Amino acid sequence: DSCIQFTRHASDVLLNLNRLRSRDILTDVVIVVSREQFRAHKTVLMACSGLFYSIFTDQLKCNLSVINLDPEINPEGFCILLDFMYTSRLNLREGNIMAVMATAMYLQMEHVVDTCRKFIKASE
Amino acid sequence: DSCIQFTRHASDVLLNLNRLRSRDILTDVVIVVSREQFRAHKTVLMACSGLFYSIFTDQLKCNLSVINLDPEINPEGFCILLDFMYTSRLNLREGNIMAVMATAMYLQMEHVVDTCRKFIKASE
Amino acid sequence: WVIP
Amino acid sequence: WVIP
Ligand SMILES: O=C1Cc2cc(Nc3nc(Cl)ncc3F)ccc2N1
Ligand SMILES: O=C1Cc2cc(Nc3nc(Cl)ncc3F)ccc2N1
Ligand SMILES: [Cl-]
Ligand SMILES: [Cl-]
């Protein structure tokens, strides 16, 4: 087409979605990761994770307001990945990289799994 | 912080949100612009438009599944702006620029109003 | 704004 | 991936 494009639009949208999450505006699901609860927008989770895409496109699961993750999932790893979904920034540290990579494999976040594998390879 | 950032994340999220819109997945509102209906995600509309942000943060309006816009709003102008919200690309043409600018002023999309004003100034 |  |  003959369109013009606003370079910062996608980043500005994501920043506003994170501001809505902060202010608990229109959050429509609670993700339970053992003893912790995380509120989020189903659409953002589906846009970032192959696991959430499969969950919320299922005719029965799309209607649930609470999703319980596998008990082996680490809440801190999930929290770091949820922040990445809403900001593009990944708080990857020597002390959390194994939990983050395991959580990203479970959530099917291929780009995160890729950077974790590379950082682990560099340490060996 | 000591975060790393995935450059293409925000653009990839927006592309996936547009794929959900295409496939009518988790759309939760219908915007009526005279005889036309447009399905969308309330969160994306709020992230892009000062008008939708004010509408869906209102305690009564946040619960509506149908929003009727002012009858003076042109459906084609709205359609072009809705596509911009989900893609960052604005289909601005000599034949639609006045309707697009008027719709962007009503929707409170300051960056779009700015580019329309500049393109109009260049023609004069 | 740019030409994409 | 970059250093923001
Ligand atoms: O690593 C990843 C990240 C990821 C996100 C999605 N999300 C969606 N995919 C499509 Cl094609 N349309 C809409 C979506 F919300 C699916 C698979 C995967 N795998
Ligand atoms: O031209 C514009 C575009 C636009 C979008 C928003 N959106 C939100 N603003 C904030 Cl601060 N937090 C969350 C949001 F969804 C408000 C005003 C305006 N004016
Ligand atoms: Cl990813
Ligand atoms: Cl704008």
Q: Taking the alpha carbons of B102, B104, B110, B111 in that order, is the dihedral positive or negative?
A: negative
Taking a contact as any Cβ pair under 8 Å apart, which residues of chain C between 1 and 4 contact chain B? 1, 4
| Calpha distance A115→B29 (Å, rounded) | 37
- Measured in degrees and rounded to the nearest 5, phi and psi for residue A89 equal -105, 130
Check if A50 has its Cβ closer than 6 Å to any atom of ligand 1.
Answer: yes
The residue of chain A nearest to residue B62, with distances taken between CA atoms, is A26
**DSSP H or E segment with residue A14:** helix A9-22
| Calpha distance B12→A14 (Å, rounded) | 11
CB contact under 8 A, D4 and A115: no
What is the three-class DSSP state of A109?
coil
Check if B108 has its Cβ closer than 6 Å to any atom of ligand 2.
Answer: yes
| Calpha distance A67→A46 (Å, rounded) | 13
- Domain spans, chain B: 1-124
* Resolution (Å) of this entry: 1.8
How many angstroms separate the Cα of B20 from the Cα of each of A29, A74, B14, B16, B28? 17, 29, 10, 6, 12
**Complete DSSP assignment for B65-121:** SEEEPPTTS-HHHHHHHHHHHHHSEE---TTTHHHHHHHHHHHT-HHHHHHHHHHHH
Architecture of domain B1-124: 2-Layer Sandwich (3.30)
